[PDB]
Write a protein that binds this ligand. Structure first.
Ligand SMILES: *[C@@H]1O[C@H](CO)[C@@H](O)[C@H](O)[C@H]1NC(C)=O
Lengths: 49, 48
């Protein structure tokens, strides 16, 4: 019973990660923050100052 | 025209520095320039 519960729990993790797109929110936010900071730094060259 | 060599290109006012390579991207007939997300020149169509 415990083996079956463990397997089914891992399978449910598989399904939930596959279906829901906002699961990896922390990593996606870190990557987006770094990319957005880089984009802002690059766009700062176009400002007259 | 020179390719795969770092040269200074002036394609009717681009006046930029870079190496020119063949590209698979396809432009609209009226379109000449090319820009990426950061609004930097990425591909230019040869006028000739
Ligand atoms: C531009 O002129 C050259 C020289 O006559 C010619 O070989 C070339 O085909 C011309 N370009 C177009 C798009 O016809």
């Amino acid at each position: 019973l415990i083996a079956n519960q463990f397997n089914s729990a891992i399978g449910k993790i598989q399904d939930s990660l596959s279906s829901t797109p906002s699961a990896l929110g922390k990593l996606q936010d870190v990557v987006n923050q770094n990319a957005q900071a880089l984009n802002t730094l690059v766009k700062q060259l176009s400002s007259n100052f | 025209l020179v390719k795969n060599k770092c040269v200074n290109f002036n394609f009717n006012g681009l006046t930029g520095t870079g190496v020119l390579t063949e590209s698979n991207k396809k432009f609209l007939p009226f379109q000449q320039f090319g820009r990426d997300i950061a609004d930097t020149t990425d591909a230019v169509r040869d006028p000739q």
